Amino acid sequence: LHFVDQYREQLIARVTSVEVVLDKLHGQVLSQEQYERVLAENTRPSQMRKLFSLSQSWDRKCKDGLYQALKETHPHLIMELWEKG
Amino acid sequence: LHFVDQYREQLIARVTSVEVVLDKLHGQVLSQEQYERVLAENTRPSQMRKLFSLSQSWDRKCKDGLYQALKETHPHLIMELWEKG
Amino acid sequence: LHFVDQYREQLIARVTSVEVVLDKLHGQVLSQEQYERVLAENTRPSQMRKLFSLSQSWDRKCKDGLYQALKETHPHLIMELWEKG
Amino acid sequence: LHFVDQYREQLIARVTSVEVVLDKLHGQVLSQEQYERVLAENTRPSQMRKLFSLSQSWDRKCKDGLYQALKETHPHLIMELWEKG
Amino acid sequence: LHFVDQYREQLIARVTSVEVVLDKLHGQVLSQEQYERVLAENTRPSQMRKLFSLSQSWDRKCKDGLYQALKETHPHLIMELWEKG
Amino acid sequence: LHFVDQYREQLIARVTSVEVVLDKLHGQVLSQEQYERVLAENTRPSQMRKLFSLSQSWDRKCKDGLYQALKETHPHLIMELWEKG
Amino acid sequence: LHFVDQYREQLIARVTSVEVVLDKLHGQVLSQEQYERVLAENTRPSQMRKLFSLSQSWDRKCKDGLYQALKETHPHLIMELWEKG
Amino acid sequence: LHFVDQYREQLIARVTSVEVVLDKLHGQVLSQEQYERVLAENTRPSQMRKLFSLSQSWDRKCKDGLYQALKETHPHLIMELWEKG
Amino acid sequence: LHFVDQYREQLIARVTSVEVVLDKLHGQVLSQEQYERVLAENTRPSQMRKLFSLSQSWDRKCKDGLYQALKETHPHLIMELWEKG
Amino acid sequence: LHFVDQYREQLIARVTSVEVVLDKLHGQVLSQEQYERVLAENTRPSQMRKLFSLSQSWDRKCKDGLYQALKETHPHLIMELWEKG
Amino acid sequence: LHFVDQYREQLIARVTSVEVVLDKLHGQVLSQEQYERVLAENTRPSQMRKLFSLSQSWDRKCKDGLYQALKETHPHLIMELWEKG
Amino acid sequence: LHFVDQYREQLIARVTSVEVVLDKLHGQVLSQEQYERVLAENTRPSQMRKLFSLSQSWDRKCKDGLYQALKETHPHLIMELWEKG
Amino acid sequence: LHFVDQYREQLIARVTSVEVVLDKLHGQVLSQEQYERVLAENTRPSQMRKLFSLSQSWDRKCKDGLYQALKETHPHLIMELWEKG
Amino acid sequence: LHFVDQYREQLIARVTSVEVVLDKLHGQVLSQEQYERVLAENTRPSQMRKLFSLSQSWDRKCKDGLYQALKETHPHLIMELWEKG
Amino acid sequence: LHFVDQYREQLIARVTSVEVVLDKLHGQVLSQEQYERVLAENTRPSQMRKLFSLSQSWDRKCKDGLYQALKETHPHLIMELWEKG
Amino acid sequence: LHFVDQYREQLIARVTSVEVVLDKLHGQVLSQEQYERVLAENTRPSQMRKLFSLSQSWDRKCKDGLYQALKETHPHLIMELWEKG
Amino acid sequence: LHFVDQYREQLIARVTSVEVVLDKLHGQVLSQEQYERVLAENTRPSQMRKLFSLSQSWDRKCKDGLYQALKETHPHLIMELWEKG
Amino acid sequence: LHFVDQYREQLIARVTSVEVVLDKLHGQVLSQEQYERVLAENTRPSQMRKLFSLSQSWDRKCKDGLYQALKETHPHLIMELWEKG
Amino acid sequence: LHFVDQYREQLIARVTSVEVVLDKLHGQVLSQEQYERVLAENTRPSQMRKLFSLSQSWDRKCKDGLYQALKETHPHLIMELWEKG
Amino acid sequence: LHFVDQYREQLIARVTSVEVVLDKLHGQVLSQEQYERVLAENTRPSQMRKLFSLSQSWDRKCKDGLYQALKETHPHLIMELWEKG
């Protein structure tokens, strides 16, 4: 199990600034079409859910990329998750 | 339950000088992008509401930071809330 | 039949300041996700409609909570509805 | 039909000193949040338009209140409207 | 074919002050809900497009009303369209 | 033959503000589940088509209810249909 | 008989925020494919119905998991069901 | 068209002693708040511009009042404008 | 209801020497930033209005402070208000 | 209407020895700060105008005080005004 | 083979401002219902894909119309495609 | 291409006294509402940008009017632009 | 890879004066509708993001145009990016 | 971290003579448009905040320039900040 | 708290010979521009208020300098303040 | 770069007799409205700053005119600037 | 069958303002002599009856004209008739 | 059933200020003799009872009049009754 | 219907100073003989009644003249009538 | 078909100021001899008829010239014709 898959629900619920993470991911991991498609969702939890629906293909490296993106944007949330573990 | 979550509605309604609290929070707790995004709202209640929409990620420590910021700016409001409790 | 269900259409049409009622309801009755989801709608009638789509689960107590929220925000509208009854 | 609804466009276009009418209305008819929200608009016609968007809830009594506020501030405009009728 | 349907694209592109036309139309032709819904769009072309999406129901009389509203607000644009014809 | 069945295609094509009619119908004629199900359609013509697929059960009284709802929302369209008759 | 099987119809009808419950269930009880498949349904009652069609395999433990998920999301609905019992 | 609206730009540019005209207008046509607000502008052209922004409400009678005020203060300017006509 | 909230409009309209009241309030009740911000307004009624927009946070004690400040500066106005009561 | 408000313009224009009236008013009606502030104006009409801008707060008693001050200083002007009445 | 069919994938991927092209096409080539249906899609690539799903009926003339619409909106993209050829 | 459209950016950047040009344009080309709306912008470049956003409707004649207004106010800037051409 | 695509995230985050770049781009590269649409976004990062969503169509030449626009407005940022490379 | 970013809040709060620093910065670091835009703010803290919103692009060299500007204008404030460090 | 901040209002009200204190402060504490700017105010209380608006930057040493300047110019006022303490 | 743009800050700071330069410039380079507007500023540095804000339009010839005006009024300052160069 | 012939009796009985319809019809459909002759009848039903006696000659176009005239004058009656149909 | 007849007992018991309601009703609904006769009762409940004994004749309009009178005098009681309903 | 014909009875009853209105009307609308004849009546209501008996001939223009005369003489009565409308 | 040829009869009948249009046309389109010859006619319709008899030679460009001349002289007539179209 990964970190992102462990607290999948937690990330979906409590991640707020999703646009920044997407922009961090865009190009390196997220195709333009996938990026816009996930961006097209209305609510932030919905955006996260679509992101996670698009995470199936990703290898361990890409999950690491997303983790890097999240650690940068929301260090506190990441701390909360590690504490929960 | 926290103090900020307890009187969420009260803070949203009756907090006025929001820019100062944001500047207090900026850097320590609020990213530049989140700070500007919350600042971009027109009305003060709207600014507070966006701030609270951005508060999901925050850990207990960050809620404490915000409490410190509010106690400094509006001691009287804080007193009113404690009395209500 | 309730009061909110009686004049469902009337509330949807003629309620304007919906954000305040939501903030009153948030936490006590409305989950963060449901609150944001209903807030994500563009027009006020649309926001009300989503709110009413989310009202199915609510017990009599929660309908009472919403009634309290509306009576506080729009006493005049509430008076109009009672007169119609 | 009311007087305010009859010449809705006329009031939106030709009412200038809107702040005074709002202050007259504030408390009695306009909540603090609604008052600030309508005040937050840039142009006077925009302020009027927001005011009219917030007028849906108002009962006949509140429309009368607004009429009183306008008759006091702009007697001449009121005369023009009656003549048009 | 009408005038509004003839230069549908032209009106969508080159009409700027749309709020005034809406206020002219509101009540007589546009319901409060339709009026707000069309107003809820961000860009002026988008507002026009929504207006035209709402124009399907309108009879010849209502298209005439809209034409009157546009001729008043933008006489020059109307002249350009007639010249194009 | 009814009025709604006569110009079934016309109503499906040229009715735009469908949400309002549904809200008018909801409770009195449309069950919550049927209401949401018809609302779940993407395009307005699709919403109308689903509404008409759900109209089979309706008695003359319910068709009258729908007619009332449409006459209120789109008087002009109703006029066009009567003229066509 | 279980609680979920007792008020199967009630849960199908009156559960609204289904996405959250699914996210709570995903991983622990719901496979990714089953989760997406149930999510692919249009209406919330349809989503619930598919969820219940997928509940056949579940052991008592998994029904308990779902109950936990529902009690968290919709405490009021759960109360209504117990009262009905 | 009026005289004041005809040479609106001319009056804005070439009227100098604006305070006297305001004092002539104050009470009869200009509310205390409007009077001070127009007086609060720095430059004379700015004062005139604000005055003209406040002239929308005025009826023909009030435009006549302003004309009287200007004819008294600046007979020469009035002569220049009539000659231009 | 307070005294300041009772005659909110009256204070906004008829208070003139606002700078002195602010200086009386500065430090004890008004932060430096709030003080300057309210001072930055052009007209005295505007200054009062901003002051009242900043009065939301204030507790009963602070409203009393403002009352003290006003009673000192404008005893006559205070008398007029009490008589009105 | 008062006497001072009736011939406001007349007093502003034709009162010359303003310092004496101020000294008569100082203490009883005019605060030291208001007195100096009105005195700080350059021209006599400007001094009068500032005095009248400061007259909003004054009760009937204070307007009477000012009238007494003017009757003493300029009996002839007072006679002219009564004749005009 | 046509130009639009040649670079079907390219147009679907890299066309951005799709609304304008639709408005250009609406009436001449696209029925109101087809226009709205293609507009109802969320993402721009999805809108293009629906447009291409609706392009089966179109004759060479209509494909030419679409080409004209695209050449006007995105000359650069058209250049890229010709270069690829 | 016009002159105003040619050096659109140049006019936006280097035009300073915008109020005068607006007053020149007001009535003949700019509606009262459009005039105030463009005036409501804070910075001069912003005012110009709004003016240019409102220039879409204008016919060649109105662009000529604006050119006349600019040539009068800023002959030097006009010379610079012609030299650039 | 281009320069703009390389530091896409960096440009989105750290570009501030976006209006000027747009005005530089408008006409040559950005259509009026695209220009207004990107301008309609609230925050500067959002404006940049929309700009980048609209950059898909652009050929190498247009990316060069944007680079020119950015180098002119923010030479320092451009230097930072080259150093990062 | 820089010095300006360290005490961002402190500089925003306690810097007073901002115009001089801007004039020092104008040309070398601040574009004319950015300079005017930051100058357009009402209050000094607001001016500083806008300045800091415009500081994102700036390289280390430009932050040094601003530091030089501040050290010259307010040596004492700079001393206070170093002591705090 | 300092002495100057303690009796801020008292100093603003009752300090008269302000020019001398400024000249004492000029060079050592007050920049030429700040000195002239504070001198540019009309009334002495206004001059003091501007001085205090410029006192934010000052360190304890500079507040001491101002205290020295005041003790020299108005020993009696200083005595009154100490007695009040 | 020009001479006036080179030492923009120096001219703003150290130019004192600004009225004379304006009178020299008035008519030839400065419109009456611009002249009064720049004159309306309180402090000399502020007057210079407004003058420089109005200098954007000026061609090389007008900058030369201003240079002539300054060389005549303040030869010594001009010498200091050349030495600095 | 036509609409006027269908509800001939209904129109004869329940049409009241007949003069207006005649004036609408006069010239286009009704000769001067026929118009006066139908007008010469005493009672409104008699006028209608004579009108219908004069309707024999009328073609479908003229019956349409009369329908237009009636729809304009008595929309409600027209609605009643359509409902009866 | 009416509102007054529904809570007849409640109104009889809990209405206190009866004289005011009578004065409101006198003339419009209550004859002088009936008014005095109901007033002649000793206790307030007795007065109400006599009022209700005199309410038999009243039409729906008069019951509405009484409701208006009560809503004005005792809004709180009216709220209690609606809640009971 | 006109305004004078609407409240014919009201004008007859509540108009008092009738001679002034007649003098205003005499010459323009009222012949010398008609003027004296209406003046010959004893009571003011009788004078009004005769005036109204003489109003049959008057065209819309003359009814407007009378309205002007009444609005000037009795603005309050005119206000009462408009409110009644 | 052209515009002038479409409403040939309308222009002949309803154009009044023909001399001005001729003067506009003279030189550019109308030879001196043709101009005088058309001018030699007595009545305005006759002048128009001769003008139209002389219009046979004119190319599309010259018909455009005449249209320009007419639009300038009689904008209202041109509007009437477009409406007729």
Author numbering:
A (entry chain L), B (entry chain K), C (entry chain M), D (entry chain I), E (entry chain O), F (entry chain P), ...: 1379 to 1463
What did the authors write?
NLRP1 and CARD8, two related inflammasome sensors, are highly expressed in a number of cell types and play important roles in both host defense and human diseases. NLRP1 and CARD8 mediate inflammasome formation through their CARD-containing C-terminal fragment (CT) generated upon functional degradation of their respective N-terminal fragment (NT) by the proteasome. In general, inflammasomes leverage supramolecular filamentous structures to nucleate the polymerization of caspase-1, which in turn increases the local concentration of its caspase domain to facilitate dimerization and activation. Here, we determined the cryo-electron microscopy (cryo-EM) structures of NLRP1-CT and CARD8-CT filaments and analysed their assembly and specificity.
Similar to the CARD8-CT filament structure, no UPA density was observed in the NLRP1-CT cryo-EM map, suggesting that the UPA subdomain, with the 25-residue predicted unstructured linker to the CARD, is also flexibly connected to the core NLRP1CARD filament. The NLRP1CARD filament has one-start helical symmetry, with a left-handed rotation of 100.8° and an axial rise of 5.1 Å per subunit (~3.6 subunits per helical turn), similar to other CARD filament structures. Strikingly however, unlike any other CARD filament structures known to date, the NLRP1CARD filament is composed of NLRP1CARD dimers, rather than monomers, which is also reflected in the thicker dimensions of NLRP1-CT filaments compared to CARD8-CT filaments in both 2D classes and the 3D volume. The inner NLRP1CARD filament is roughly equivalent to other CARD filament structures, and for all NLRP1CARD subunits in the inner filament, the dimerically related NLRP1CARD subunits form the outer layer of the NLRP1CARD filament. The total diameter of the NLRP1CARD filament is approximately 140 Å, with an inner hole of ~10 Å. The NLRP1CARD dimer is mediated by reciprocal interactions at helices α5 and α6, burying a substantial ~300 Å2 surface area per partner, and involving residues with large side chains such as Y1445, M1457, W1460, and E1461. Different from the CARD8CARD filament, the type I interface in the NLRP1CARD filament is more extensive, with type I, II and III interfaces burying ~300, 430, and 140 Å2 surface area per partner, respectively. Charged and hydrophilic interactions dominate the interactions, including R1386 of type Ia with D1401, Y1413, and H1404 of type Ib, R1427 of type Ia with E1397 and D1401 of type Ib, E1411 of type IIa with S1395 of type IIb, Q1434 and D1437 of type IIa with R1392 of type IIb, and E1414 of type IIIa with T1421 of type IIIb. In contrast to WT NLRP1UPA-CARD, structure-designed mutants including R1427E (Ia), E1397R (Ib), D1401R (Ib), E1411R (IIa), R1392E (IIb), and E1414R (IIIa) compromised cell death measured by both LDH release and caspase-1 processing.
